[PDB]
Write a protein that binds this ligand. Structure first.
Ligand SMILES: Cc1cc2nc3c(=O)[nH]c(=O)nc-3n(C[C@H](O)[C@H](O)[C@H](O)COP(=O)(O)OP(=O)(O)OC[C@H]3O[C@@H](n4cnc5c(N)ncnc54)[C@H](O)[C@@H]3O)c2cc1C
Ligand SMILES: [Mn+2]
Ligand SMILES: [Mn+2]
Ligand SMILES: [Mn+2]
Length: 498
């Protein structure tokens, strides 16, 4: 059927858009290919933890996987599983694996909650056509409040066993002259203190994050999406995947939408039409829809920038072996709280998460997720044979990112007389994981594939809202930027277009 506005997906861009549309009185249908995560499972919990993965952990895979960095300790808990509509999707391209959330809330279900504003000077570099004053004066504050960002208590952090791992890396970094910063989060840190005191059910302190948090984490289903539903003007249909988009002969857009069950069986194929169409299917999903539409002739006036300009936010993972006298602890909160800010906008820039590890026994490993400044970009290229966009990124394109991460961590190793681990990513000696991405950015870049508010070039009332807009890099964990940009865009689009 017809609905005035359709939003594809339910991640950050989508959720912001739908809230503001509903508040403007626009009846809005959100179409989400994953589940609404609210049914207690066989362990009584909605989500599986990292030490008890099951089919809930994975989007249509036949075996669970260890969290990256932890195969040596967590492969023992891996099991064969039925393909199921689980929460975390490892999307494999030829030389890159991109991890995304699947469900009501998108990546907010599976991410580490880290809510970080980009450096203004870097924002101005990457998006020079955007007025940075309204971003910092209005939209970043709006995002901060709506997301329910909060801050860890410094004395609790300093004292608790659950953050020893962070304190160890802080001390090691400090010997190299490198500073750390606290990382704001949407996980309720008050709740986390109570978990450590045995006062409330554990989640972050029970090895949960990447397959969802049963408590504590204010994912988008609790924040923007709950508010959107509260307007009375928004509904969400789950296990509904948009496959194609066309402009109807009489105006507006028509979608082919597959409804599946949680086993992936096709239940129905529906045609859903609308006046206003907002894409919030993520860097991968929105880009694939538009490359498909261009190259199959259903949106033939899309431009050549559709598909272009993808980067992995410079993501690189690495690990150091601590001295025996610097154990990192068996009990590590699953929510990071500290990072190393070595980002000055130069090509040497690194902003690196001090990542917890879930093994739950002492390994002496410090793990890091580095965000780097690497100019290389990929393109999503439609394959009509398999009906898939394929990302053409090759591993050598991450060499600048590896080189930056390695220069930084080499300083820390030199100051401390430590070495890397080489065995965390596979049997081949490899200290830097260079073929994964948690932060996909680009494919439908703001001001190139779209105008400076995400209006898709060549079309009226067709909008992109999400990580596909960002030009490959933001220098920090990306969801606050996606959120704030979406606030900016939807406010302007509603004013001028709706
Ligand atoms: C392991 C991990 C850790 C992370 N940690 C952090 C962190 O701590 N902080 C941070 O800032 N970022 C973090 N990120 C990144 C962050 O989660 C993403 O940048 C963000 O979720 C992207 O938002 P989005 O709106 O672009 O898309 P998404 O959040 O990916 O949402 C897209 C939604 O659209 C749905 N969808 C896709 N295609 C279709 C379709 N055709 N039809 C219907 N529905 C569709 C998806 O199922 C999904 O629910 C992390 C991500 C991962 C995977
Ligand atoms: Mn604050
Ligand atoms: Mn519980
Ligand atoms: Mn030393």
């Amino acid at each position: 059927g017809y609905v005035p506005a359709v939003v594809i997906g339910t991640g950050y861009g989508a959720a912001v858009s739908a809230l503001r549309l509903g508040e403007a009185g626009v009846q809005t249908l959100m179409l989400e290919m994953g589940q609404l995560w609210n049914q207690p499972g066989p362990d009584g919990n909605i989500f599986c933890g990292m030490l008890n993965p099951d089919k809930r952990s994975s989007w249509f895979k036949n075996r669970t996987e260890a969290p990256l960095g932890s195969f040596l300790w967590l492969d023992v808990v891996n099991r064969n599983i039925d393909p199921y509509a689980g929460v975390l999707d490892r999307v494999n391209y030829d030389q890159m694996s991109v991890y995304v959330g699947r469900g009501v809330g998108g990546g907010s279900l599976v991410n580490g909650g880290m809510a970080v504003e980009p450096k203004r000077s870097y924002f101005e570099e990457i998006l020079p056509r955007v007025d940075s004053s309204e971003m910092y004066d209005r939209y970043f504050p709006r995002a901060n409040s709506m997301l329910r960002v909060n801050h860890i208590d410094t004395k609790w952090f300093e004292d608790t066993e659950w953050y020893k791992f962070a304190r160890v890396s802080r001390e090691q970094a400090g010997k190299a002259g490198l500073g750390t910063v606290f990382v704001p989060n949407v996980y309720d840190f008050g709740y986390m203190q109570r978990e450590a005191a045995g006062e409330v059910p554990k989640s972050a302190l029970a090895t949960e994050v990447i397959y969802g948090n049963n408590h504590g984490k204010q994912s988008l289903d609790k924040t923007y999406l709950a508010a959107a539903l509260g307007t009375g003007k928004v509904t969400i249909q789950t296990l509904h995947q948009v496959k194609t988009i066309r402009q109807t002969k009489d105006g507006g857009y028509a979608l082919t939408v597959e409804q599946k069950d949680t086993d992936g069986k096709l239940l129905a194929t529906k045609e859903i039409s609308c006046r206003y169409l907002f894409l919030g299917a993520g860097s991968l999903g929105s880009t694939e829809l538009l490359v498909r539409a261009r190259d199959t002739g259903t949106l033939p006036n899309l431009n050549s920038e559709v598909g272009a300009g993808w980067g992995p936010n410079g993501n690189i993972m690495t690990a150091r072996a601590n001295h025996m006298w610097n154990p990192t602890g068996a009990h590590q909160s699953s929510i990071p709280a500290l990072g190393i800010d070595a980002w000055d906008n130069s090509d040497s820039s690194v902003f690196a998460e001090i990542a917890p590890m879930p093994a739950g026994l002492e390994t002496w490993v410090s793990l890091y997720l580095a965000i780097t400044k690497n100019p290389q970009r990929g393109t999503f290229v439609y394959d009509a044979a398999t009906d898939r966009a394929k990302l053409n990124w090759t591993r050598d394109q991450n060499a600048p990112a590896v080189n930056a991460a390695k220069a930084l961590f080499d300083r820390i190793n030199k100051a401390n007389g430590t070495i890397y681990r080489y065995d965390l990513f596979g049997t081949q000696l490899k200290a830097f994981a260079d073929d994964f991405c948690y932060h996909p950015l680009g494919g439908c870049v703001l001001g190139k594939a779209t105008d400076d508010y995400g209006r898709v070039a060549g079309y009226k009332n067709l909008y992109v809202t999400d990580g596909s807009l960002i030009p490959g890099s933001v220098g920090v964990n990306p969801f606050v930027t996606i959120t704030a940009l979406a606030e900016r865009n939807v406010e302007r689009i509603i004013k001028q277009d709706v």
